[model samples]
Target chain A: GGDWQEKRKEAFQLAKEGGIAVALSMLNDGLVSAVEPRDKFYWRLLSADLLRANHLDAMAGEQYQTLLNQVTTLSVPEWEPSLVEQIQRYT
Target chain B: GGDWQEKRKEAFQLAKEGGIAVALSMLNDGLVSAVEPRDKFYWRLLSADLLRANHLDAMAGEQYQTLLNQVTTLSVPEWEPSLVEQIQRYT
Candidate 1:
């Protein structure tokens, strides 16, 4: 219900204020099948960034690859530039 | 596979070059379960704007209401301002 939305916001706040690990864990634990793919994609993107920030190079690379696979067939034109940027960074 | 993504982009291009009706129909007709909610939401938002532009006030209002219902509990901070704008416009 509304609590799910609240938890997501809080997780994001944690990411911004606390740290990436806390935010990532919150997202992972709270993840539910009913959640929308767009929401999941957004979280995964954030988690990948946090992984990279933490210098978990191999893990970050894996996460980036997963993201690339997920977004590969999406038709959002605006996402292309960001996708390219991440691909370059992670490669 | 990639064909689905191509079709979606083509629909967007049609919307940009042809008109909102064309875009809305394309989106509605091509919609599939595998498509992501963010993508679906983006299209619905565009369709609402198009309905408003065409002077279909009642239809536009209905579409806006549906969108409002769909997004009532999402956790994207960036969506708040846009949501407010749509609500004010529709109400």
Candidate 2:
């Protein structure tokens, strides 16, 4: 039972007429997020622009800000810790 | 040992400076293709905007066209077989 969306022509038409809107719809569908560590820069900007266009900037910005803030105060991990010396105290 | 890309602050900086450009760069780094199957409409628009902004519409558009063509002439599997009511003997 193939639905209408499975039709290639229909999919392309939807994609053509609803490209950017489709992308934004993914966000609402829980497919993407602001703090998702976007490796695709264009995608990040697009996400920002989309949110802004939809007037969700305040909420989106909060998420972005949190992601940015997460950049700072990051943990150093256990193995990379106490490397200042040869650990003579423990030895 | 973690390389520089692991430094989250630096990563953010690169991301901020790069944004859409970074997304496009990913396209060049063997990720290749046009508009990609962007489920997000905004990102797709941003991708198109990026090509126009960078003045590579001709090249990018060709890829987009090819992708559109591909979506149209694609095919699916035939695992379902003939399951009509005429197969009453098998049923």
Candidate 3:
């Protein structure tokens, strides 16, 4: 039996090393995923973002949660998406 | 024999406690002395000022010295007076 816990731990370790390059890779992967229509990992992507916002000191509380919800339930990532995360990258 | 040093130290100590009211009183006292043509104790006043500003954090810089000199050497105490010292009292 493939231990999901070990897989998750390995995935997390890989994510830790991922950083900006990994996030960019995820965007590229997202384009590929959209074409194939694999499992909707968009919510997982959003959840990752919420985790990040919780860690930042300067950002307000409700704003992070609202963004997290918006990201998770994104009906159209193209049209209605929280732009702050990308905006922060450049700023 | 009148020790000017003892008198000066005493005067400084008295001036230290004098505050803005005393400064204004000096201005009014100035009216008294100006009419009488006493030695312009205005230098003494600016010297007192430099000492007081040294105690406060913001004012203890090179900028105050230029002010101290200009205020001290008022031949007319009219338009010739560097007006910033009076300007500060209101602000």
Candidate 4:
């Protein structure tokens, strides 16, 4: 339970500490999501956010597109409706 | 009151909808705090956060410094200890 919580904070932590490029590298390298499956999907969300925030809209669109596609087919009580709306906005 | 509560949301809404320049103007105009004392002080905190996020550290430092001084003399049984600790971080 708590295991993945701190584990998932890594990309956000890196983004704050080293800026988007380094955090993007961490995401692109797959180091941030290598620990589990759910976070692997979440990694796409986070990566798309970084891309979206930094004006990389086309790449951001791809990430959100796939994430929206994948996440729509499943059941996740934890995901935020506002964030899902955010993903939808870009797609 | 709910009047000032939604009043506060106006700045955050501008930040999200129109970006920091609009949000910063809203804070500087004193229009956001034309309502109450408790909320007037809260404007500084939110303004401080926006300034800090935008690399306006000299201004942010001023806000937080005064907030630490002011909030320290207060008593709020309704507030969270964690938020109190946030004030203490600059000390």
Candidate 5:
């Protein structure tokens, strides 16, 4: 639990210290290596945001769409609102 | 009315043609003249995104905090998920 929290904090620091692009790369790589669904979801969501912030609208749309495609039904409470908005905005 | 629909379309065009900063400026000015809560909310949300995209973290945080402060409770269904994420991100 502590490590999870620490990793999340490190991710935040990466976003702050590096640009969105760098943070996005780390998140993408992390997503590939993550074993947990919760962690995967976090990476995808953050990646979508980095794309949006960087004006990579098409890529952001794809990321959101890919996530949306995986779920049979949207659990709105469980899902991040920003991710929903990104999907709605791009596609 | 058709005019309302047209205005919304125009706003979208402004966002696409001009950049987040220009869109934000227009939204802020529109918010002052807006007669409806729905419109005000739209402007504020878009303004927050623009600030976030520009990496004006402090300003974005303030925008989000101001909106969060105004609401008694968050109506998630009525709110854009991206805006929520933005608030969660910056503040």
Candidate 6:
């Protein structure tokens, strides 16, 4: 909870302002503080989506693939549908 | 939030106590007010697991199949891994 949601909003605002780089960097740097697994899952989704939207196919694929693995191995089980759809998006 | 976590723990306790039927009833009856999609996903997982553990294959299969469909179609990417593993359990 903490500052996670607040930072997420700011990052979204940055992205909406077309500061994709800034938003990406914000997510990258603050990701560590996203203590909850679900929080990290969402942050990662946003990061991957941003990269994919910008045509960073390889990078987006790398992120989504790792995320899918996490959902399987880590027993997070709840994170796969969005990850799969995002994977399907560019495939 | 709310009584969600409490009920989840109680359901797990019921499962641990081998009162699988009781736990399943709890999950099934209380599922609607789970409110959060994540909450419902977890409740359904518990319900399905108890059913499978009790040799209720047909019923369990029905639950898991519908749940997997929920995973793929409902945009709830996170709920797939355990569902997949659970599906693989008796298949």
* TM (chain A) per model: 0.57, 0.34, 0.29, 0.60, 0.54, 0.62
TM-score for the first chain in candidate 2 comes to 0.34
| lDDT of residue A63 for candidate 4 | 71
Q: Per-residue CA lDDT of candidate 2, range A1-91, in tens?
A: 1221233233335445578477556543433432233222224433544555556657666545543443333321121222211221211
Worst 10 residues of 2 chain B by lDDT: B76-85
Error of 6 at A84 (Å): 5.0
Q: Model 2's lDDT to the true fold?
A: 0.36
Which of 4 and 5 is the better model by lDDT? 4
Model 2 TM: 0.23
DockQ of each: 0.05, 0.01, 0.00, 0.01, 0.02, 0.05
In order, what fnat does every candidate score?
0.00, 0.00, 0.00, 0.00, 0.00, 0.00
Ranking by TM-score: 6, 1, 4, 5, 2, 3
Between which residue pairs do clashes occur in model 1?
none
The per-candidate count of clashes, in order, stands at 0, 9, 0, 0, 4, 9
Over A8-67, each residue of candidate 1 has an lDDT whose tens digit, in order, gives 456656766688776766667655432555545655665565666666778778777876
Rank by lDDT, descending?
6, 4, 5, 1, 3, 2
TM-score of each predicted structure versus truth: 0.40, 0.23, 0.21, 0.37, 0.34, 0.43
Who is ahead in TM-score, 4 or 6?
A: 6
Compose the digit string of candidate 4's lDDT tens values, residues B9-87: 7776777667878777757577454344444566676677666656677767877887676654543312333454666
Q: Write the per-residue lDDT of candidate 3 for residues A1-91, one digit (tens) a residue.
A: 0222333344445455656445445544544554212123333344354345336433434444544454444332232223434523422
Tens digits of per-residue lDDT for model 6 on B15-61? 77777666666566787766556556767766666666667778778
Greater DockQ among 2 and 6 belongs to 6
For model 4, state the Cα shift of residue B70 in Å. Answer: 0.9
| RMSD over all Cα atoms, model 1 | 13.6
**What is the lDDT for A49 in model 4?**
64
| Winner of 1 and 3 under lDDT | 1
In model 4, how large is the Cα lDDT of residue A33? 38
The weakest ten consecutive residues by lDDT in model 5 chain A span: A71-80
Q: Write the per-residue lDDT of candidate 1 for residues B4-86, one digit (tens) a residue.
A: 34554566567666886667765666554325565456556655655666677887787777766656555432333444455
RMSD of each: 13.6, 23.1, 26.9, 15.8, 15.8, 9.3
State candidate 3's TM-score.
0.21
Q: Give the interface RMSD values of the models in order.
A: 9.7, 20.5, 39.1, 16.9, 10.2, 8.2
Q: Give the winner by TM-score: 1 or 5.
A: 1
